[PDB]
Design a protein around this nucleic acid. Structure first.
Ligand SMILES: [Mg+2]
Ligand SMILES: [Mg+2]
Ligand SMILES: [Mg+2]
Ligand SMILES: [Mg+2]
Ligand SMILES: [Mg+2]
Ligand SMILES: [Mg+2]
Ligand SMILES: [Mg+2]
Ligand SMILES: [Mg+2]
Ligand SMILES: [Mg+2]
Ligand SMILES: [Mg+2]
Ligand SMILES: [Mg+2]
Ligand SMILES: [Mg+2]
Ligand SMILES: [Mg+2]
Ligand SMILES: [Mg+2]
Lengths: 185, 49, 104
RNA sequence: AAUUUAAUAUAACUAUUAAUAGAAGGUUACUAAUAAAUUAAUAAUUAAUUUUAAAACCUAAAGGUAAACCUUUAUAUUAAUAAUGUUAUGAAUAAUUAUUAAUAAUAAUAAACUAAGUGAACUGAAACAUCUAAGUAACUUAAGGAUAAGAAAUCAACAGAGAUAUUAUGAGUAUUGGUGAGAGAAAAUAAUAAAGGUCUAAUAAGUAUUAUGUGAAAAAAAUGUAAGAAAAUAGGAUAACAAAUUCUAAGACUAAAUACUAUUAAUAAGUAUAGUAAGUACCGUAAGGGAA
RNA sequence: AAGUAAUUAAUAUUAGUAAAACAAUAAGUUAUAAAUAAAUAGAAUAAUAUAUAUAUAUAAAAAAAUAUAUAUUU
RNA sequence: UAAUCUUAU
């Protein structure tokens, strides 16, 4: 097979922003939660952006009679709503799937496994939703593997002292501001 | 935020690092000389015939 | 000698740079991790146990071999025994005629 | 000293070739200004390079709206001080001014070229229904200075070639068609072209393949539904099978020749009704049409 | 204010070259041989067709058709 | 009936 309707897609190349450079005119309010999906978000069978369609877009072709009188028809995939169990998330995740995709999931032995397969083909035939799911699972796995220590209290201890010092000079100091200051330190 | 690397990807990276760590095959001056001499001999033989 | 070597075609020169003749590369398929792994053969990766495709794909390999033949630098290239390709006079001599030719 | 002829302007468009590069409108006003440096040349200088000031309102996307208006309140808080006057008991509570620190904001952005989605009909066939027109017009979406393609699961034929792109021959040949209308390759040889090869993949499975429904007029690679492999001892390629040959899918990157726009130069058996105004006048509710 | 252009094919006239032409990098197109659906076939054994070549047919002729031959190849 | 699906909170 091929992933033509996926890998044809192109997204505007964001310029790498240096810390000292000037701002863009429209900077967003809330930050980027998820990683950027290489292949954007489908602009044709937008039905499939909400689910795990397995790179199965709608076809259009011809109904043909005994007289060979051609008439345009479309061929939809066998989509199905299906709440499937994630071991990593410890909850079942309900989404639209192609019956094919459900079969693949069953073969691979789980939904998390299906999401996390490292092949490029899989990545292509994950949606934007599928990509987000993968990210959620992978991040959770990483957390499970590696808890922070294998600092917050120190910051909390120092904060009031820092505030007092600021006041003695003359200025007031908030927590949030303190946190912002001492993130990289 | 950058997506984390899955297990297979990490293993591949480790393998690549190990490969890099080994001594790299590089074409020595001596090897080039040996080749060049052989080429010359071949040319001489061609000229003769 | 060095000047003569330099005068060799580009692809051949590049090959010699990146797979030099000091290393005696294997005739048979090997581990992908091995130093003597033949770039023309499909070597097996030891962990996954999957045959990797040859580092030099078959066309490129053939071109390299033809270049070597032209400039008489065959034996410095690693062996093409277990790659099924023969070339020119050796191919002509060693081959069996087709069943159709011998027995119509 | 003057006149003539030819060429050249800040001051025409159009076609070709070559080279280079990938770019604000309107509204009406409390009108929407600029300042400098260094280097070279000829203190003033012109030129190059660099810095710097202001710049209203509207042009979907701060929030509205009946474009050039209204409302949000950054000549804002919040805090800390200092000066002032009042209340109640030197300390406390509110208001005004002036410094210091902290908190967010401004989409007018091309058009052509490219890729993807959906996809007509008139028309031709001297009717018309397969076929054609045509994957064209159109609408829709998305990208970049170009895009696309690209280092063979390619071609070929027992001899061999060696990524792709464009053109010439091959060739209107093979091929195909209600065998009508008509449609029509490839190998090979030439140019143009750039260093043109090179790993970034732990070598790829619901994949190849099969059935079935569709699918570039020849030549497939695609695709909905469902069955579904193999390890280089293998796998793809041709009705089929046997021999042989060739290549390695289900992981990737890539200048260059090309397209379009703009600029500059050069050439015009081009244009003065294809020679600069104006998308104005005027017509229409409107999209839109459009003078002299 | 109305037979124009492009890519092609066939004729004719002239001009260049001529058993060759165009092109010169090779490659190609046309000509140089006529046939036949096609095939491994193809033009005086001692001369004008009464000979020869091809297609049908055949042991080989004859028979129909077209083509080839009478110092210099067209 | 933890196949599917409809409704309400
Ligand atoms: Mg605006
Ligand atoms: Mg109102
Ligand atoms: Mg299209
Ligand atoms: Mg008709
Ligand atoms: Mg009619
Ligand atoms: Mg068509
Ligand atoms: Mg590209
Ligand atoms: Mg592979
Ligand atoms: Mg493979
Ligand atoms: Mg099929
Ligand atoms: Mg066509
Ligand atoms: Mg590959
Ligand atoms: Mg690419
Ligand atoms: Mg007969």
């Amino acid at each position: 097979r091929q992933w033509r309707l996926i890998e044809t897609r192109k997204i505007a190349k964001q310029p790498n922003y240096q810390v000292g450079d000037a701002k863009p005119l429209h900077m967003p309010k809330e930050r980027k939660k998820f990683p950027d999906y290489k292949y954007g978000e489908s602009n044709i069978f937008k039905q499939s952006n909400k689910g795990l369609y397995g790179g199965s877009f709608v076809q259009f072709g011809n109904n043909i009679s005994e007289s060979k009188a051609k008439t345009r028809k479309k061929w939809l995939p066998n989509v199905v709503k299906k709440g499937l169990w994630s071991e990593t998330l410890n909850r079942k995740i309900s989404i639209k799937m192609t019956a094919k995709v459900l079969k693949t999931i069953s073969k691979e032995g789980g939904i998390d496994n299906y999401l996390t397969k490292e092949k490029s083909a899989r990545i292509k035939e994950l949606g934007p939703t599928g990509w987000k799911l993968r990210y959620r699972v992978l991040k959770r796995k990483d957390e499970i593997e590696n808890p922070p220590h294998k600092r917050r209290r120190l910051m909390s201890f120092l904060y009031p002292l820092e505030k007092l010092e600021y006041r003695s000079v003359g200025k007031d100091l908030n927590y949030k501001k303190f946190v912002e200051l001492f993130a990289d330190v | 935020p950058e997506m984390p690397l899955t297990e297979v990807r990490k293993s591949h990276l480790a393998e690549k690092k190990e490969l890099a760590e080994r001594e790299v095959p590089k074409l020595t001056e001596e090897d080039m000389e040996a080749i060049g001499a052989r080429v010359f001999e071949f040319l001489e033989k061609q000229k003769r015939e | 000698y060095k000047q003569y070597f330099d005068s060799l075609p580009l692809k051949l020169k590049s090959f010699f740079q990146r797979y030099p003749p000091s290393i005696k590369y294997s005739p048979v398929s090997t581990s992908t991790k091995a130093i003597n792994a033949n770039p023309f053969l499909p070597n097996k990766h030891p962990v996954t146990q999957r045959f990797h495709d040859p580092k030099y794909s078959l066309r490129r390999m053939s071109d390299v071999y033809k270049l070597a033949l032209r400039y008489g630098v065959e034996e410095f290239l690693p062996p093409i025994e277990n790659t099924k390709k023969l070339f020119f006079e050796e191919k002509y001599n060693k081959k069996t005629l087709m069943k159709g030719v011998l027995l119509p």
